[model samples]
Target: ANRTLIVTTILEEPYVMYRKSDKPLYGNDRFEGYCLDLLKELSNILGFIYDVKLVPDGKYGAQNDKGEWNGMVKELIDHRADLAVAPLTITYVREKVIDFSKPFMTLGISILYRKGTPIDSADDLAKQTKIEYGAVRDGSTMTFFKKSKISTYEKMWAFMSSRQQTALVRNSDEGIQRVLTTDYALLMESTSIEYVTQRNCNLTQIGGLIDSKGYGVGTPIGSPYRDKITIAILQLQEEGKLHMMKEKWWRGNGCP
Candidate 1:
């Protein structure tokens, strides 16, 4: 088709980041990274041109007390975007409102903390009041804790909810800065933790994954593109292109 698709995404490092240029860049030329590459490949395979746009709210997507969604999910719900080509997690609630291609990457939730910390696991964070920890507000990580029934996570959620004003950071960069400057820990996606830890030696993952999930492309419900996109993703995975793309973006200079 000659029609141009609209892709809604967030400016997350490694997944989606702005390209550096001496002069101004426009349209797709302004961005580069794993998701951009993936989008390019998907475009080639599916034969569709796309225009990438950042999610207006600067959020991944989450439901509020009123059951309203914000972020890319909302864009999808309202058919504002043809697809979401970001590191959007494929979860039960999101699946109900939007269609998802098969996961392009598998990852889990984990903790991000600065070095020289006494914390070794979520249990350590849950048991201590000296250090405060939280996740990117309205992200899947925060929703995970809010919905978890496991005792440790429940306790941790209680602590975070109690101090939501201070504990919850607006985004990953904010959470990472908090971790570096304060006695704070961040519950983040394992893949993001990997990227951050590789670049900043002072930060490291505190424990193994807390929950397993995968990142998938999102579409409006019943969109004709979903199956084609899923097929394209599986083709990329089988061809080993997905692995190569990940390496291209995630391979940072080694920490000394």
Candidate 2:
């Protein structure tokens, strides 16, 4: 493997994770996941070696007030990584700095809530006044509220974060747990919501997708591999392998 690609990804279930082993694992051998498998196929076609490394800050990457990027996106911007093959959302701001392959999967934002919650939409939660809703801080879900062109989402952000008490959560697991314990709602990517809801009977997602988006494989703005990877994804789609692999990883199978 003369060319070793440095792949940056975040640890998200069904997307990427360390494979269990009695002996210490190394390189791609240490991981087994949707992205890892897809990467393997891409490597086979492109004829290169890749080493999977977790995103240093564990963030999907976002711009701060000073116009600086952080997380996986920053890794690419700084040439620290060659590929990001995780659940990184493709957005206008991001695309301005980096390139993305054709969407591997399409999804949108959604609300995760306990079964007893009466809300179906962001407006429902907003109008209720007493209902509580929050999102992982700095997450795409939160970014959606902060920057969405839609009036409803813009107002939704102002409403949720307005009170003296802060509603910003630490992470998805924290927000999801809050939903289970209290009359709360968590705004997250629909794919994650779908995966979590399937594993937890008490949790469910309601209402339509908030904004249509897709998770794409990211590279630096002028990366040569972009075309090749796009071709690989297209081939995988043509063979029905992408859909089959998703079902294999996301369904929480064997649940009674």
Candidate 3:
């Protein structure tokens, strides 16, 4: 049976962005980015039709204290989306709820701050109170700090939680704006930091990666497409198409 997959994604720079068009665009025509390119490739290789839809909540995905999941993860769990093909991270908690294809991109958590800031590391931010710091609320980066047992991360988490109302931003764009307009540091994925720092001269990545992780294609639990999607990702990686796609989207104009 021919099936048209429902792909869920979010609007994230480099990964996914709304295409700038003079005329109005509809459906998939409205979007373009690395993920869109990847989805095209995947469709070509797999010979499947797909419909791209944005996650309604506009969040990557996170589990709440009540054990309920939200964002793309919930969409997959609820069978509303057949696949999630954004810069969604592969984490243990998410794995239990939905299956993930092999990582398409590997990255790590890093600090995004103003270029002239004295802070050089997560430790520096954690140790200081003057310059506020936090990650996107209910995002994987925040989940990492929330779940980590390390003393530094724990302390940082405490600080963020103490002032969650103000510390946690709605999304990366909001966090980036805070970093530019205020003395704030955004804890985000290295890939995102790379894209942001490349485009915005004033923002820079501080210190090294905090922890390594990967972004993978997500599918509903026990979905038959999981293995095929994983194989396709592996094929793309082997053929260097993945790297090429990244370059196409991530390569920014000079930052000087």
Candidate 4:
């Protein structure tokens, strides 16, 4: 099958990964997940050809922030790619440099910890000073954990005299892996933590959800396409596709 319009995305597994076979896109990897499905419908409504590509896991966010004309958002900024169909989040810092499309998906901050560990609640993770915290750059979810209101509980959080065992990674994957492989690290979501936690069987999302947040389609600041994507999302909301997407991503409810 030939796609007249092309969209670029990387293999995100159960979300947007390329299949093992050489079959045309729309076969399996292209049509299996919530992300791919929403993008497919968006293409039909907007009247364009869409394509997908595979890239590094977390490069999308970093590139969009750095604005080097690469990554998913960079493609839109330079017109190399029409849109990014993979899961992208809209944050205030990024909003300063890029225009967002009214929050396509929203997620909350969940503290993911390794099983058989001592900590039982999120408050425990928050109250610990001796143990370091980890997150995606300096985004909002990180701010939630850093906020004074959320950082004062010591019921479950504790620091022990052991190895320099606190873990904070550059991205969710690393942080989640750190939690799974070891029990000392706790991760905060600058974007979405539950999704990352959902990937691992060894780890568990413990305690209450820390905060609520949403994501928007982004273009470089005032690029003319900003409203188009925003309009597309709003139309999806009205037509029920947005709700459908929510179900597909976050248990059909779209996050907490």
Candidate 2, position 233, lDDT: 88
- How do the residues 1-256 of candidate 3 rate in per-residue lDDT, one tens digit apiece? 5689999999898778889989999999999999999999998888898999999999888888899999999999999999999999999989988999999999999999987768888888899878989999888999998999999999999999998999999988999999999988899899988888888888888999989989999999999999999999999999999999988988866586
Q: Which tens-of-lDDT digit does each residue in 98-137 have in candidate 4? A: 5667877667666666666556566666565544445543
Q: What is the TM-score of each candidate against the true structure?
A: 0.97, 0.92, 0.98, 0.67
Ranking by lDDT: 1, 3, 2, 4
Q: Provide the RMSD of all predictions against the true structure, rounded to 1 decimal.
A: 1.1, 2.2, 1.0, 6.1
Which one wins on lDDT?
1
Candidate 2 or 1, higher TM-score: 1
Reference-based lDDT, residue 124, model 1: 85
Per-residue CA lDDT of candidate 2, range 70-176, in tens?
A: 88889999989999999889999899999999998999988888776567787787678666788877667777787877777877888766841557676677787
Per-residue C-alpha lDDT of model 1 across residues 1-256, encoded as one tens digit per residue: 5789999999999888999999999999999989999999999999999999999999999999999999999999999999999999999999999999999999999999888867899998899888889998888888898899999999988888899998988989999999999999999999998898888899889989988999999999999999999999999999999999988988866675
lDDT of 3: 0.92
RMSD of 1: 1.1
Candidate 4 at residue 187, lDDT?
49
